[PDB]
Amino acid sequence: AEVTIEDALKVVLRTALVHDGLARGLRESTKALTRGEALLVVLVSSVTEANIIKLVEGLANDPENKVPLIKVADAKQLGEWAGLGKIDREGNARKVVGASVVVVKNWGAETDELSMIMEHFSQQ
Template sequence: MDLLTALELTLRKARAHGGVVRGLHESAKLIEKRVAQLCTVTSQITSSLLRLSALITTSTCLLFQVPRPSANGLLCKIDSEGNARKVVGCSCLVVKDYGEDTTALNIVKKHIESN
């Protein structure tokens, strides 16, 4: 299983349990509360994302970078059949509850910790 597939499966499980928050403002609030477990941001850095990544370094949240905002949008809007729908760019999304421990989650965690 490759990394992006593992990330997609992890986010699908988290969405099923109501554990995914999208957007810069909502993500920052969860990171400040120390509730966030995983944060995916785009590699197209803006000043807001720089502040957010500085906030992440002070917390225990794991940071994962995706190549472009539409990739984050693809990951966070998946229907029950596994197809992406209504894809809109998303600069940041945060997982506050993984739902359950899966092999896909372990693959994502190992990749983040090794980098």
């Protein structure tokens, strides 16, 4: 590669993984969405009935300042970038079922990755 290709979301879910910025799970995520905390909502695509997708992008794009999103694919790898760790001979080695809706609360950090994604979804 050159620098990275959509790995800049991985680093931010890692910073909200270790330093407790993930409202991980749709219900706790919507508690961070029905709070001013959410300046990142990262959803997935292949879900069933599409109504919770409608929930996520509804509360993530509703008219209140509060419009965070970028976008990212499948649930279980999104949860792997997000917070649940059991590494154990680290070749992905897990019984993990998906997370599919994780929301970063303030991300507690800064530059090129996190400043890049804020520059990236803020200004085109």
